[PDB]
Amino acid sequence: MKTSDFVKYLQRMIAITDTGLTFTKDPFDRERYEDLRSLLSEMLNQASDLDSEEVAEVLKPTSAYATPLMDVRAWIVEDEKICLVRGQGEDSWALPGGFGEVGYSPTENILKEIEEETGFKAKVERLLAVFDTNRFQLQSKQYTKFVFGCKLLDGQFQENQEIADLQFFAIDQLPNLSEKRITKEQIELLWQVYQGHRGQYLD
Amino acid sequence: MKTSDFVKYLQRMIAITDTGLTFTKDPFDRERYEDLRSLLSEMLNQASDLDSEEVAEVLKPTSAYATPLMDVRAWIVEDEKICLVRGQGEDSWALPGGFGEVGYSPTENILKEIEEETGFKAKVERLLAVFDTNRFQLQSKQYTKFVFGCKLLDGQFQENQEIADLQFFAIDQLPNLSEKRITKEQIELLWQVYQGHRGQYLD
């Protein structure tokens, strides 16, 4: 593909993205258009010919099948209490995290989720568990739920469009849990792994 | 622009656009994402030598939720040699495994694939690594590649419709690898984790 054809596609996509940035009324759509606009701008700066044979060989294999969905969670313990967050408009609590996003590794995914939800930079210590939601919180979609032990670094919690509150809870004083995201049984297993009283948990 | 960066940009923009289609509640935002997906499809056609079937395979929506996909692999060592399999119609070798199927847990998935491919029942001993395919073997889809250390139990290898051959190889006498499934660098890393020279590998 020639540079001029690449520029054509990029400019057409930028037009649509800019329209989204002007007209959308939804903050989560706005975030997506901001992400797209940033990527497209970088791409335009880098516009060049592309080796279409090389592109095809990097893309292969092209066939893909549905798998369980990636979910990432952070296990953060301070003063023997666990960090839980409560979503906007929700009355239940869960470990920070959410869907794994394409374009980020497993550890980068949890760090991205921690920063966006909690307002803190963080470090990943270890993977504590890989849970199957079919075992612990059966739902219409199946997830592979990675739970990483993490430490918070610099930052500050700020209520935002995703998260209404962030608090630390003793395991014998847990609040109402969002079961589809984390259960008391999972928290108890995680505490055992965290304290080195059993090995990494795998479903 | 580098080929690898083009593929990562495309992969990411497909994921964002698909997330917009699933989550937006406004018909004009829906149309914007649809128009973006049409442009991504046109750009991919022009940027790559993929045939029409292959292009459709890349663009076929795999899921309503765009996340990295599951791939599972088995690390089986006997007499200090590593089990590799060669698929029917293929000249190269990989660790047993494949994509994670919905309806099975991560360990159940690897045990199922070990039995189907190698003819053996097995035990999962530990998780050795979770690799990001975007790092080690970039391809159209991003996978979280779980590599489980496993021990074979009862059974027998028989050539079947999926697998042409199964052999054990010394760490320093590896055959030609199916790199989109496993690389020499990954095998070397895995050997170090397996031998306890370093901890679990996580991207």
Author numbering:
A (entry chain B), B (entry chain A): 1 to 203
The authors write:
The 1.39 Å resolution structure of this enzyme shows that it is an asymmetric homodimer with two distinct catalytic sites, one “open” and one “closed-in”. The C-terminal catalytic domain contains the Nudix signature sequence that encodes residues involved in Mg2+ binding and catalysis. The two C-terminal catalytic domains form a symmetric dimer stabilized by an extensive network of salt bridges and hydrogen bonds formed by Gln200, Leu127, Asp203, Thr107, Phe146, Gly103, Tyr104, Asp132, and Gln142. The two HLH motifs stack against each other to form a four-helix bundle. The approximate two-fold axis of symmetry relating the N-terminal HLH motifs does not coincide with the two-fold axis of the C-terminal catalytic domain dimer, making UDP-Xase an asymmetric homodimer. The asymmetric dimer has two different Nudix active sites, each with the conserved Nudix box sequence. The “closed-in” site can accommodate a Nudix substrate but is too small to engage RNA. However, although the “open” site could potentially bind Nudix substrates, its cavity is large enough to accommodate an RNA molecule. The “closed-in” site, formed by the N- terminal domain of monomer A and the C-terminal domain of monomer B of the UDP-Xase dimer, is ideally suited for binding UDP-N-acetylmuramoyl-L-alanine and possibly longer Mur pathway substrates such as UDP-N-acetylmuramoyl-L-alanine-D-glutamate-L-lysine.
The Streptococcus pneumoniae gene SP_1669 encodes a Nudix hydrolase. The gene is located in an operon containing MurF, suggesting that it plays a role in the Mur pathway of peptidoglycan biosynthesis by hydrolyzing Mur pathway substrates. This enzyme contains a modified Nudix signature sequence, GX5YX7KEUXEEXGU, in which a conserved glutamate/arginine pair that forms a hydrogen bond in the canonical motif is substituted by a tyrosine/lysine pair (position 7 and 13 of the signature sequence). The enzyme robustly hydrolyzes these compounds, indicating that it is a UDP-X diphosphatase (UDP-Xase) that hydrolyzes substrates of the form of UDP linked to some moiety X (UDP-X). The UDP-Xase from Streptococcus pneumoniae, may be a member of a novel Nudix hydrolase family whose members fold as asymmetric homodimers and act on bacterial cell wall precursors as well as RNA.
